[PDB]
DNA sequence: CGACGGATCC
DNA sequence: GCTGATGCGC
DNA sequence: GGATCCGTCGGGCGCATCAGC
């Protein structure tokens, strides 16, 4: 069935106005996304912080239009050194973070999948979680990564609340995809990946912003295969999320799914926080 | 990975 | 330099 | 015999490399 994202709630339950707007987007090729007007959408969204996944671009090859974003002047980029054309993440911010780091401490490594940015009141992590792959060939690798990432996130020294955003490459529950029964042995909906997501939420711990606000909302997806007109039919998956520390729930105004924004097989997601 | 063909279930 | 084929990853 | 289950197959897109010219 079709989905219409509710209007933006820019006010906290306590009545406090949103001060921070973060947008996350798997762009499926930064260079292609820009030619498809992605930055025009970003300018209309006007987010304080933009997190990008699947840039598939080294920093030297970033289009010049990225240097014409004065509201997002502080840019940090990480691509895999040995996997040119794959993965790659970026974080763009209005204000400079206090600290920026890359990776999850111990990987293999320039994997181009994780950026950690410390701000005054919170730590932001953006991630492009490794896919299990066609035929589940990288499922065990994913399981090992999930555990390492869970430990890294829990073991952050900062006693600052955490915001984790990006493509977590898993639809947590049946409500998170149109075809749950046919996808239980497909990447993104394996019991192993779903269990990893649940373990992530309990260990750090973390809460799913969108599901916290919309626990029984179906048909809300952030990804549709380019194949078989899946996007027109709304046959999709919710793989993109904003996960928050419990301390940040009073500050939660809204978690949006920008279903109409084009440029990728993923749609962007937007978080409003009253800090 | 959604579409589809074929089996299985009440 | 540019196009199209192929390979890889989804 | 409609509903459900499950296994199989062909395809959208981006980027890298290569071959030809
Ligand atoms: Mn992708």
Residue numbers in the entry: 43 to 150, 152 to 318
What did the publication describing this PDB structure actually write?
AP sites are then processed by apurinic/apyrimidinic endonuclease 1 (APE1), which cleaves the phosphodiester DNA backbone at the 5′ end of the AP site using its endonuclease activity. Upon binding an AP site, APE1 flips the AP site out of the DNA double helix and into an extrahelical position within the compact APE1 active site. In the human APE1 substrate complex, N174 is within hydrogen bonding distance of N212 and the AP site bridging oxygen (O5) and deoxyribose sugar oxygen (O4). To assess the role of N174 during APE1 catalysis, we rationally designed four mutations of N174: N174A, N174D, N174Q, and N174K.
We next crystallized APE1N174A with the same AP DNA in the presence of MnCl2, promoting APE1 cleavage of the AP site. From these crystals, we obtained a 1.97 Å structure of the APE1N174A mutant product complex in the P1 space group. Within the active site of the APE1N174A product complex, there is clear density for the cleaved DNA backbone and bound Mn2+. We overlayed the APE1N174A mutant product complex with the APE1WT product complex and observed similar active site conformations (RMSD = 0.208 of 2449 atoms). An exception was active site residue N212, which was positioned differently in the APE1N174A mutant compared to APE1WT. In the APE1N174A mutant, N212 fails to make this rotameric shift and remains in the same position as in the substrate structure. Hydrogen bonding is absent in the APE1N174A mutant, resulting in a 1.6 Å shift of the 5′ phosphate terminus away from residue N174A compared to WT. In the APE1N174A mutant, residue 174 cannot act as a steric barrier due to its reduced side chain length, resulting in a shift of over 2 Å away from the active site metal ion. In APE1WT, the 3′ hydroxyl is 2.1 Å from its metal cofactor, but this distance increases to 4.4 Å in the APE1N174A mutant. This finding indicates that in APE1WT, the side chain size of N174 acts as a steric barrier that, along with hydrogen bonding, properly positions the AP site within the APE1 active site for cleavage.
